[PDB]
Amino acid sequence: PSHGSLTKAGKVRNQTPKIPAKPRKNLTPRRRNIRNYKRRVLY
């Protein structure tokens, strides 16, 4: 059948290179719709 096994558990997760990501904080509910109003309804 398939050439998988329990010995390959998570093989791809340890194969991707580790690229650090920037820190990020998300907006409050009021600031989100201010952003969406400015970017969709406006130009």
Partner 1 sequence: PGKKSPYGLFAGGKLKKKRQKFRWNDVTYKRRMLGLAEKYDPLEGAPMARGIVLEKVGVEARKPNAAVRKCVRVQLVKNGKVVTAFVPYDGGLNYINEHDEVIIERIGGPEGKSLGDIPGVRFKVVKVNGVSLWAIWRGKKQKP
- Minimum CB distance to partner 1, residue 33 (Å): 29
Sign of CA dihedral 11, 14, 17, 20: positive
Q: Does 39 bind RNA (CB under 7 A)?
A: yes
DSSP state at residue 7: G
Q: Is 31 left (phi over 0), alpha (psi -120 to 50) or beta?
A: alpha
Instruction: Work out what residue 25 binds among partner 1, RNA, none; the CB cut-off runs from 5 to 8 Å by kind.
Output: RNA
Residue ranges binding RNA (CB under 7 A): 1-5, 8-13, 15-22, 24-32, 34-36, 38-40, 42-43
